[PDB]
């Protein structure tokens, strides 16, 4: 019907320790990609200070 499906999600009251763990986030984000059936092209994760994590996983079919 459409070329892609896009979920815009807001997550509240998360495990704050998990949210500020750049390595864990990369692991989960990458498994999430696997779980969805997608093929990962590349991924880049960065950690902010005093806290915060940003990550992107580029995919394909």
């Amino acid at each position: 019907k459409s070329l892609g499906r896009h979920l815009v999600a807001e997550f509240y009251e998360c495990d704050r320790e998990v949210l500020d763990n750049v390595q864990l986030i990369e692991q989960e984000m990458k498994q999430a990609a696997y779980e969805s059936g997608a093929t990962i092209v590349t991924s880049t994760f960065h950690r902010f200070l005093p806290y915060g994590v940003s990550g992107v996983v580029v995919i394909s079919e």
């Binding site: 070329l3 892609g4 815009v8 509240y12 704050r16 992107v56 079919e61």
Partner: protein, 56 residues
């Protein structure tokens, strides 16, 4: 396509985007895994159709 995440530990908040293409890829499966991994207690999700066939 992308799967992105931006966290605000100070607020226990995370902005997540799951954009997938293809019949054979399910963004809700990615969602389910992250909801579990982050232990989110409350979530709000809007599903967008990107590139509607009747539009392109």
């Amino acid at each position: 396509x992308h799967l992105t995440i931006h966290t605000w530990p100070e607020y226990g908040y995370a902005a997540i985007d799951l954009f997938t293409c293809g019949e054979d890829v399910d963004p809700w499966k990615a969602f389910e895994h992250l909801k579990k991994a982050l232990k989110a207690k409350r979530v709000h999700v809007v599903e967008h159709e990107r590139g509607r066939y009747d539009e392109i």
